[PDB]
Amino acid sequence: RDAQRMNILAGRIIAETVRSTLGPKGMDKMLVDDLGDVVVTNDGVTILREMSVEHPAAKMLIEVAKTQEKEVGDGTTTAVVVAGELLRKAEELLDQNVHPTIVVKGYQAAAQKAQELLKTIACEVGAQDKEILTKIAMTSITGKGAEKAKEKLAEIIVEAVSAVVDDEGKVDKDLIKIEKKSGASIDDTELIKGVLVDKERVSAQMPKKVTDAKIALLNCAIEIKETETDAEIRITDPAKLMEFIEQEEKMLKDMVAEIKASGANVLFCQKGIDDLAQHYLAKEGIVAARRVKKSDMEKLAKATGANVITNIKDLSAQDLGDAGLVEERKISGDSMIFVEECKHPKAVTMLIRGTTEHVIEEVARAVDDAVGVVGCTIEDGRIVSGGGSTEVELSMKLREYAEGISGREQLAVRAFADALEVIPRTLAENAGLDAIEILVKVRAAHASNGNKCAGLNVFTGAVEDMCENGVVEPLRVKTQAIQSAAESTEMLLRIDDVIAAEKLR
Numbered sequence: 001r002d003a004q005r006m007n008i009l010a011g012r013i014i015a016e017t018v019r020s021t022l023g024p025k026g027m028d029k030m031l032v033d034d035l036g037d038v039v040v041t042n043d044g045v046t047i048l049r050e051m052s053v054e055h056p057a058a059k060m061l062i063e064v065a066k067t068q069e070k071e072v073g074d075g076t077t078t079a080v081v082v083a084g085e086l087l088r089k090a091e092e093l094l095d096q097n098v099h100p101t102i103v104v105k106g107y108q109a110a111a112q113k114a115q116e117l118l119k120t121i122a123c124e125v126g127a128q129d130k131e132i133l134t135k136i137a138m139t140s141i142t143g144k145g146a147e148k149a150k151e152k153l154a155e156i157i158v159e160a161v162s163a164v165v166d167d168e169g170k171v172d173k174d175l176i177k178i179e180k181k182s183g184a185s186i187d188d189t190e191l192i193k194g195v196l197v198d199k200e201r202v203s204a205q206m207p208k209k210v211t212d213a214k215i216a217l218l219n220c221a222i223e224i225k226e227t228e229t230d231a232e233i234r235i236t237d238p239a240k241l242m243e244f245i246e247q248e249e250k251m252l253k254d255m256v257a258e259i260k261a262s263g264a265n266v267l268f269c270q271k272g273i274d275d276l277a278q279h280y281l282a283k284e285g286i287v288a289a290r291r292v293k294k295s296d297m298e299k300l301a302k303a304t305g306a307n308v309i310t311n312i313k314d315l316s317a318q319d320l321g322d323a324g325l326v327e328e329r330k331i332s333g334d335s336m337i338f339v340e341e342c343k344h345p346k347a348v349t350m351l352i353r354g355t356t357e358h359v360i361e362e363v364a365r366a367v368d369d370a371v372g373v374v375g376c377t378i379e380d381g382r383i384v385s386g387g388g389s390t391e392v393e394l395s396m397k398l399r400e401y402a403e404g405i406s407g408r409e410q411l412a413v414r415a416f417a418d419a420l421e422v423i424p425r426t427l428a429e430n431a432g433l434d435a436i437e438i439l440v441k442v443r444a445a446h447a448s449n450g451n452k453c454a455g456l457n458v459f460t461g462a463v464e465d466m467c468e469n470g471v472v473e474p475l476r477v478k479t480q481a482i483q484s485a486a487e488s489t490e491m492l493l494r495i496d497d498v499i500a501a502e503k504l505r
């Protein structure tokens with residue numbers, strides 16, 4: 001009869017399976033499909049992909065997460081666990097002779113009112129504030145897994161975001177890139193100036209150790225070019241193999257000589273080069289390369305002061321490039337240079353170092369996400385104290401402001417406040433502590449003149465400072481969750497154009 005009563009119970013099942021999987025520490029479930037591949041992933045959208053749905057009333061709970069996942073791509077699960085709580089509370093009031101129109105009207109009023117109260121509590125952060133910028137490093141590195149030396153790693157990684165700041169004070173994630181190679185320790189990486197090349201050689205032959213060498217950035221190749229008109233090549237003389245090999249050397253000796261005579265010394269070709277042509281570069285001491293990634297000519301435009309020219313035959317003095325500090329260093333075998341740009345942000349390559357292929361890759365899974373949570377704070381230049389602090393702070397104010405709202409809509413504004421305090425509750429159950437006797441103590445700090453920089457620590461299990469400890473998340477990761485949640489949860493109550501039994505199309 002009610003029909004919808006069968007759908008309200010579906011949001012709790014999909015939310016319960018991803019309820020205890022919050023916070024850094026937490027088990028990961030697995031939905032073994034008909035294939036057999038057993039995989040586990042703590043991320044939110046990952047587990048939702050490889051999974052089958054039964055009732056078609058669940059295609060509107062994940063769709064709202066895709067909009068936020070494409071932007072911040074972090075903390076999207078927090079917006080789903082909060083919907084299941086306020087959903088169960090709606091059932092407790094629906095049977096009390098309350099129409100759904102009165103419940104949907106309260107969430108819209110509480111959601112819009114929370115914006116005015118959030119901006120006041122939202123702290124301020126400057127792009128140039130070096131003292132405050134370092135506080136964001138410990139907040140990001142600790143939200144993943146690297147406590148073995150967070151005090152040292154957080155000091156060298158802050159130098160990148162601190163130096164790759166633009167005049168306007170913003171920063172993008174595409175300007176940062178990470179790699180992985182063999183080495184000793186992560187401290188081997190150094191920041192000076194320049195952009196690193198991605199691709200490498202294919203055959204070992206050319207010299208690989210020449211300190212101070214002029215670089216030439218061009219795109220061309222030395223091969224028999226064919227005219228635009230349709231033509232072909234015919235050969236009927238097997239006795240013509242050891243002839244052009246000597247004549248072709250004259251065209252390459254004087255041509256390649258212009259590269260060294262002009263001033264340049266290193267060149268990144270676009271296509272493979274003959275083997276014999278490479279043996280001469282070793283004895284003469286000339287360095288060269290080939291098969292360079294296309295996404296490297298524009299990066300080295302101003303990073304070193306070079307010029308991008310098409311053809312290589314006409315490499316005059318004006319068509320010469322430039323390099324920063326070509327200091328060759330043996331990288332546990334192959335000597336290369338790790339030039340890193342910072343003065344002019346364009347594409348820094350803070351590669352990873354380590355004496356283990358399995359460890360250098362593990363750090364990449366974390367450092368790649370640190371620039372995102374740390375870079376977004378510099379863009380908008382605003383941050384709100386997290387860790388269950390902003391949740392208990394607003395709940396105490398909505399109760400006092402709700403006294404003035406006279407009408408039947410005062411039941412939703414009060415029940416909605418109990419759904420915002422679920423963030424510290426899930427973290428308490430993970431540690432194995434009673435989530436009832438501890439909530440009364442959290443409100444003691446944020447009673448009257450409680451500092452907004454306070455919250456709760458899951459490790460020690462007691463109220464501590466947020467900014468000092470480093471528990472402050474951006475403002476867009478929490479405002480978009482509550483704003484998108486209030487707009488998506490109300491869709492289930494609204495019905496008018498449902499896909500009832502009226503043909504598939």
